[PDB]
């Protein structure tokens, strides 16, 4: 019955930043909150409980505020170990329903980059196997966010792609994208343009790329 | 040298039962509350239960999403915590993590008796998988280097990995010589229930047709060893 919304869904920092996220939760909940951190890979980490309760072992640059429906932590003088996504939790209930947010990812801030796109047709051997995937590839490119919106003959399309993204490059801090259109040879045969259109921050105006059949 | 190691999981149909085991170190196990999280490809955290210490009579608590299906029980004597589940779905698929857990108590006087809770030690999870997939090795399909997928002066060009079950597969592209450049994406789960990604690298557009570029892709669970050469 408690829901738990966290703001913003992703964070840009460098090392040395202070860093906010919220938690506002769909009912007043006294100091009833938990904090976890968690990166890919490793088992999360509880952080903070009672909303300000430090957990023993825990850096004291992990702050929790907050008593009623709005939440904070407060990551200060952010470090390298620091890049993860953070999940406030409620722990109101006496029958228990332990709702977790949503999740905030906190990623390594670099400077905006664009992505190179790119568009693959299917190929002739897969349109034999009854089959037709489009690939729309977004290369190198930061932030994280990016719409990626399908048109075909000028009409657009739901339900029928997927995106598949990197984790953030260890190196350069970029991501690359995928989004994938599939239709049967018998939709592919039929119509005649196909286009991906890209926005990203790095942009001032969409890039759209295109094919048409043949 | 508190540690947690859940075992158990793998693969398993709808509509089956399976049993994850976790066992505890380096703690008094039976003095604590215990318990299970998850977390579903692609989305966030979810709590499946907990169980109270024997002394105080064991009651197990549930997730709304699993109660009806799932009983939590305990093994003091071999300081293991079991998940015991049944009627199991597809959207039951998720990484389990056993939780060792506190309840602090809460200090102001209208509330004695009240308690904080949480999940204070993790393990590093066990997968389960729930499909009526039958294993299947890849289809490999070269996605060719051409106009429409040139940026500047750089060519894109890739292999899609599709209709395979179940994970995962391994990409290379040229035995292992050529690395720069390289991005194999994370697999994604078709509404057929086979999985499906695309390796791609970017090159000089002067590379093609005096370079060749060939992606290795390895499907263990199938044997399966596909060597594509991708042409323009």
């Known amino acids: 019955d408690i829901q738990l919304t966290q703001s913003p869904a992703s964070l840009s920092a460098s090392v040395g930043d202070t860093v906010t996220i919220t938690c506002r939760a769909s009912?007043?909940?006294?100091?009833?909150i938990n904090w976890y951190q968690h990166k890919s890979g490793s088992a999360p980490r509880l952080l903070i409980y009672a909303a300000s309760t430090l957990q023993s072992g825990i850096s004291s640059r992990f702050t929790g505020s907050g008593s009623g429906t709005q939440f904070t932590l407060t990551i200060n003088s952010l470090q390298p170990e620091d890049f993860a996504t953070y999940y406030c939790?409620?722990?109101?209930?006496?029958?228990?329903?332990?709702?977790f947010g949503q999740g905030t990812r906190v990623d390594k801030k670099r400077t905006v980059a664009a992505p190179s796109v790119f568009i693959f047709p299917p190929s002739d051997e897969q349109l034999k196997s009854g089959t037709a995937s489009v690939v729309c590839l977004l290369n190198n490119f930061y932030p994280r966010e990016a719409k990626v919106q399908w048109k075909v003959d000028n009409a657009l399309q739901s339900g029928n792609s997927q995106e598949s993204v990197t984790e953030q490059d260890s190196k350069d801090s970029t991501y690359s994208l995928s989004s994938t259109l599939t239709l049967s040879k018998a939709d592919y045969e039929k119509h005649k343009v196909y286009a991906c259109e890209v926005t990203h921050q790095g942009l001032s105006s969409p890039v759209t790329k295109s094919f048409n059949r043949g | 040298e508190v540690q947690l190691v859940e075992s158990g999981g793998g693969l398993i149909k709808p509509g089956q039962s399976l049993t994850l085991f976790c066992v505890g170190f380096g703690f008094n196990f039976a003095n604590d509350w215990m318990g299970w999280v998850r977390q579903a490809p692609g989305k966030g955290l979810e709590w499946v239960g907990r169980?109270?210490?024997?002394?105080?009579?064991?009651?197990?608590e549930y997730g709304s999403s699993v109660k009806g299906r799932f009983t939590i029980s305990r093994d003091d004597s071999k300081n293991t915590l079991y998940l015991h589940m049944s009627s199991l779905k597809v959207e039951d698929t998720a990484v389990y993590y056993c939780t060792r857990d506190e309840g602090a108590p809460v200090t102001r006087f209208l509330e004695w008796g009240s308690y904080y809770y949480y999940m204070a030690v993790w393990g590093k999870g066990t997968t389960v998988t729930v499909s009526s997939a039958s294993t299947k090795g890849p289809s490999v399909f070269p996605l060719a280097p051409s106009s429409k997928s040139t940026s500047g002066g750089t060519a894109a060009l890739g292999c899609l990995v599709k209709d395979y079950f179940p994970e995962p597969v391994t990409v290379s592209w040229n035995s292992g010589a050529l690395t720069s450049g390289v991005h194999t994406f994370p697999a994604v789960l078709q509404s057929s229930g086979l999985y499906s990604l695309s390796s791609v690298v970017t090159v000089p557009s002067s590379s093609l047709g005096t370079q060749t570029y060939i992606c290795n892709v390895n499907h263990k669970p199938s044997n399966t060893k596909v060597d594509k050469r991708v042409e323009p």
């Open positions: 939790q409620e722990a109101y209930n006496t029958n228990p329903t332990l709702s």
């Open positions: 009912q007043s909940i006294k100091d009833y």
């Open positions: 169980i109270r210490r024997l002394k105080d009579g064991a009651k197990a």
